[PDB]
Design a protein around this nucleic acid. Structure first.
Lengths: 58, 142, 126, 188
RNA sequence: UCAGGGUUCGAUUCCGGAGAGGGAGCCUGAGAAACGGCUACCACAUCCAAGGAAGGCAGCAGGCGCGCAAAUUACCCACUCCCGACCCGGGGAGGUAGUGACGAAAAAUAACAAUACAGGACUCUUUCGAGGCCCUGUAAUUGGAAUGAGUCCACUUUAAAUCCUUUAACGAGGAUCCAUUGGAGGGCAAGUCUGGUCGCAGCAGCCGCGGUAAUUCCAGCUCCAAUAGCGUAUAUUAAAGUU
């Protein structure tokens, strides 16, 4: 351990800091509901019955 | 089991219900007013007070931590309170002998989670919000 | 030009020495029509001078092209100067509004109440 | 103080009781996508007007046949459903009001009619033609996509007369491009 | 707020009552035990040449104190109505504008073509391959057309003005004319990604996460929900057949 126990703010002060990697604008209003409809219903690829969620990483 | 049913029984029915309502724990404290005299806020949602002392309280097992808290004296009654300070490192903003706004912890006078005997939390310091200090939107004026 | 005028729910009014009606104006592709152009066209309808004609309250519908207002024609200018409200005579030079503020009138009254007999020194220049 | 104002107003929708019901979420999104709507509140408006219609018909069906109130308010509710084209003239009794669905009302919007009448190429293009002053109902320029078209108003939807389609002046893009194009020869 | 039966609230624009710092007494008048009338005691408090004199915002604006907690010392009798000896004078009653995310209704923030790759019908063919017609994206990036948000002249508006509606002139390629507030173990929609910390710092309504390979802390990316709005404290109705 470095310095004392019961020291406030430790982990937010240790953590290495990284800048935002985004650039492009997102859609708003009607145009975002249009995009969500086309992605969820219109053209779709089938799977085995253990069906897969929208954010599957591995 | 035996409830009376006769067509002239309305005085027995009305007055027995009135007598039996006083056995409900929520009804009684709302209508006697002893809880309204005892509550360190006089029926308000929030209160202002002045910071006496900064303290660390040991959490209840099966877990292990030191929970950062403050002891506070309220402006309108002069009575004493202890209150929790949310988020990582926020105790560094608070200083001593200055005004905080305090609020309830979310369970209508009962304690919350592993912290023993703490019923309140800090929400504003020297007229700036802890959220605006923590997200870097504002700073303490000096 | 395309600017056209019509008149609706007309009445003669012998108790106030006038005739009175609702006025509809068609004007597609233009801004609202000036009241000076409206009153010379009404003069050409009723075969009077435009000097005894008063028109007011014109409002234009959403998408444009049409507007509606109210108007009156008097029997002679001395009946008009008796029966019209003073602000409509002032719209074209027949009356002049007094130029004191309401607070000047209030505070001169409250200074006069502190004196008795021939008070004029608190009135002409006070 | 007393004042000449008035304070009458009301809400036109209700929120659902289960926030995250999977069976409800995708059904509402399918109605948004098929009719070209902006948000969930725009669907919850149409469910509320249908619920109030069915709540009234279920009351009148309790009263005796040929009761004076069942005769008067029942004939009024049935005329008013036929006037907007939601109900068939050949049906015309309270028993068939209980068979109506939300998609009967979403079809009577001006945005749906501008697309189905062939003035536009999609349900998303139709809203943009309405909201940009290009479209007319009888004599009147109209600017509101949720306007509900009456059955005699049905055959009088058209372009505006002061519009670059419909016979008016060209827009500010075509005028600038022509101006600076002639200026390409010099002195413009 | 509510299946049916109920529970809770009502200082607050309409109607009735009471009171003008606290108690008491009384003049005038058709009508008052009146306070923008008077007399005295009790509590405050202003001026003075110390003899004396004067006072009542729980009217409209404005200030101090209190507290979690509430707007301008603006314009006018044009409208609605009232008072007087009156067709004419008066009205902080009342009307108008300012402040105003208490709260309610409507409604933008991208539409459409061409091109390359992609899905699936259908036809010729044993299969391979080709023709193919209707819908998705998204990149090196293509193309022309539409429009109000803003700026600003005129009419209209009104007591005089502002605002709204009407109408000339400027006004869009996206790297801006850049949407936010809370979440991603379960209840409960959505990551058995990648870096830091090591029962510490912290999270957690509730059950629970952290002791060197964290689905829960601190951050990057991706995704979820509602949307000009979303989170938290506290009173209260339903759920409660837990009165």
């Amino acid at each position: 351990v470095h310095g004392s126990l019961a020291r406030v703010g430790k982990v937010r002060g240790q953590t290495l800091k990284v800048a935002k990697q985004e650039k492009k604008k997102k859609r708003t209003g009607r145009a975002k509901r249009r995009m969500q409809y086309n992605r969820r219903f219109v053209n779709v690829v089938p799977t085995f019955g253990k069906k897969k969620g929208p954010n599957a990483n591995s | 089991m035996g409830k009376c049913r006769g067509l002239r029984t309305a005085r027995k029915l009305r007055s027995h219900r009135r007598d039996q309502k006083w056995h409900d724990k929520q009804y009684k404290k709302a209508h006697l007013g002893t809880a309204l005299k005892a509550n360190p806020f006089g029926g308000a949602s929030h209160a202002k007070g002045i910071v006496l002392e900064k303290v660390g309280v040991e959490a209840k097992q099966p877990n292990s931590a030191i929970r950062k808290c403050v002891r506070v004296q309220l402006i309108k009654n002069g009575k004493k309170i202890t209150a929790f300070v949310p988020n990582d490192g926020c105790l560094n903003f608070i200083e001593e002998n200055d005004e905080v706004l305090v609020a309830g912890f979310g369970r209508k006078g009962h304690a919350v989670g592993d912290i023993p005997g703490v019923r309140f939390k800090v929400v504003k310091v020297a007229n700036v919000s802890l959220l605006a200090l923590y997200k870097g939107k504002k700073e303490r004026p000096r | 030009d395309t600017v056209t005028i019509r008149t609706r729910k007309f009445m003669t009014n012998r108790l106030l020495q006038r005739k009175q009606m609702v006025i509809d104006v068609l004007h597609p592709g233009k801004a609202t029509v000036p009241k000076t152009e409206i009153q010379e066209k009404l003069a050409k309808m009723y075969k009077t001078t435009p000097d005894v004609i008063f028109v007011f309250g014109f409002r234009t519908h959403f998408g444009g092209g049409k507007t509606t207002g109210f108007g009156m024609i008097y029997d002679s200018l001395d009946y008009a100067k008796k029966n019209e409200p003073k602000h409509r005579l002032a719209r074209h030079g027949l009356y002049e509004k007094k130029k004191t503020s309401r607070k000047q009138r209030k505070e001169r009254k409250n200074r006069m109440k502190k004196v008795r007999g021939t008070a004029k020194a608190n009135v002409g220049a006070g | 103080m007393p004042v000449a104002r008035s304070w009458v107003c009301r809400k036109t929708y209700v929120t659902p009781r289960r926030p995250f019901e999977k069976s409800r979420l995708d059904q509402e999104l399918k109605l948004i996508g098929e009719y070209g709507l902006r948000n969930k509140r725009e669907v919850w408006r149409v469910k509320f007007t249908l619920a109030k219609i069915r709540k009234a018909a279920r009351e009148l069906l309790t009263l005796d046949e040929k009761d004076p109130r069942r005769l008067f308010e029942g004939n009024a509710l049935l005329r008013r459903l036929v006037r907007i084209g939601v109900l068939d003239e050949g049906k015309m009794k309270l028993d068939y009001i209980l068979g109506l669905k939300i998609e009967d009302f979403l079809e009577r919007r001006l945005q749906t009619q501008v697309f189905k009448l062939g003035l536009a190429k999609s349900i998303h293009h139709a809203r943009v033609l309405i909201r940009q002053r290009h479209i007319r109902v009888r004599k009147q320029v109209v600017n509101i996509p949720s306007f509900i078209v009456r059955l005699d108003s049905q055959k009088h939807i058209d372009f505006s007369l002061r519009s670059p389609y419909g016979g008016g002046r060209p827009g500010r893009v075509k005028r600038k491009n022509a101006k600076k194009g002639q200026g390409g020869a010099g002195a413009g």
